[PDB]
């Protein structure tokens, strides 16, 4: 019967997933908005680029 | 009585991780950018229509200079375009028809392709010869192929319908990781910007962030109801997005463990085929079954713009690696090239 080294090797993956460094969510979330206001200049689909600089003019 | 206190202690374990994630969610994405201020109406153009496609489009992939890009189709095609100026650099005839997926190198000189022939096929754009010949057929998938993505020239990872995502050498042919873990069919898979990392979404409603050197699984993601169809990583590669069958697309965050937001609507009942993130990641592309492809806002889940105008259900999506602009294919043979004007 393979459902025993199944059941084991789920028991393992869920032994290794558990021990895993978790940070708040406050400080996740602040990095992702700062990283979404650092780069907002340069994303031309955010703010629209003039027309004479669209390569799709 | 053996294996029944294993599933009991595993059991166990899955609350212990759930109650850590929960103690862990301190806020949500929603109270947290609640006060930042909106994208308002987004409002994007079909500049070019790439047209030349004899049957529904499967897949597509900007290249790196943010121009080329090949598109893959179950005409048995993968025709690369010059999205400038609309025009068709290569027509490479697959061997086989059915093709569910396709990649252009980070440098370039290969195109990948592979669907229900089981065999993730590279393609040599730059040869002596001149024509576009195959290098290397991947062949050792048991299931159908469903996304590739070339970490370098040489290695290239693939997600197949055999619950199972591969990392290859193109060099030798031989899967070099085989990452296992999935219950359900693995549907897409998106390489992190660091690249030592990568996600992938599967049909049992669980997306598992692997390691490519590691070649096993780190950490594993719930929420979704139905199958995941797409993923894409936020630019910072520290979050990705994923799209299901339930008309959901879903944040999570690596970091965190979690989910952080979810993009649903009560008018959208479809599932979404393909999504894709902003250059800054502040707007996340889906494309539904509804012949539309919305715009969400990733820190507002706030839907922004929409690219209608497409007359087929849109099966592929793709963000410049610039970002200057967005390139959704459809099932009605036509790749569109949709950015902002001022």
Redesign the interface.
């Known amino acids: 019967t393979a459902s025993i080294a199944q059941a084991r090797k789920l028991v393992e993956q869920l032994k290794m997933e558990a021990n895993i460094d978790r940070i708040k969510v406050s400080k996740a979330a602040a990095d992702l908005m700062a990283y979404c206001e650092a780069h907002a200049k340069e994303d031309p689909l955010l703010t629209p680029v003039p027309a004479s600089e669209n390569p799709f003019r | 009585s053996?294996?029944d206190q294993?599933?009991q202690?595993?059991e166990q374990?899955?609350n212990?991780?759930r109650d850590?994630?929960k103690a862990?969610?301190?806020?949500?994405?929603s109270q947290?950018?609640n006060n930042?201020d909106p994208?308002g109406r987004?409002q994007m153009r079909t500049?070019?229509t790439l047209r030349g496609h004899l049957a529904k489009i499967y897949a597509m992939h900007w290249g790196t200079d943010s121009?080329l890009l090949v598109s893959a189709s179950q005409d048995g095609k993968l025709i690369i375009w010059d999205?400038?100026t609309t025009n068709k650099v290569h027509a490479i005839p697959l061997r086989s028809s059915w093709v569910m997926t396709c990649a252009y190198a980070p440098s370039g000189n290969y195109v990948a392709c592979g669907g229900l022939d089981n065999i993730c096929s590279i393609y040599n754009l730059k040869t002596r010869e001149g024509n576009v010949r195959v290098s290397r057929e991947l062949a050792g998938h048991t299931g159908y192929l469903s996304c590739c993505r070339f970490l370098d020239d040489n290695q290239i990872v693939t997600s197949s319908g055999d619950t199972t995502c591969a990392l290859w050498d193109i060099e030798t042919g031989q899967q070099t990781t085989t990452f296992t873990?999935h219950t359900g069919d693995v549907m897409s898979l998106s390489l992190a910007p660091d690249t030592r990392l990568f996600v992938s979404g599967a049909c049992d409603a669980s997306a598992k962030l692997w390691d490519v050197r590691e070649g096993?699984?780190?950490?594993?993601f719930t929420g979704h109801e139905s199958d995941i169809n797409a993923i894409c990583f936020?630019?910072?590669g520290?979050?990705f997005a994923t799209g299901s069958d339930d008309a959901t697309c879903r944040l999570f965050?690596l970091?965190?463990?979690?989910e952080?937001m979810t993009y649903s609507h009560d008018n959208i009942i479809c599932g979404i085929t393909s999504v894709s993130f902003?250059?800054?990641?502040?707007?996340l592309l889906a494309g539904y079954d509804d012949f539309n492809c919305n715009v969400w806002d990733?820190?507002k889940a706030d839907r922004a713009g929409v690219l209608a105008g497409h007359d087929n259900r849109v099966s592929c999506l793709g963000?410049t690696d610039?970002?200057?602009?967005?390139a959704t294919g459809s099932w009605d043979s036509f790749l569109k090239?949709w950015?902002?004007?001022?």
């Open positions: 053996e294996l294993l599933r202690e595993a374990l899955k212990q991780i850590a994630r862990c969610a301190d806020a949500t994405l947290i950018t930042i994208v987004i500049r070019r121009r999205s400038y873990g096993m699984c780190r950490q594993t936020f630019p910072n520290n979050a965050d970091r965190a463990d979690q952080l902003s250059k800054s990641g502040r707007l990733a820190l963000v610039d970002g200057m602009a967005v090239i950015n902002g004007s001022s």
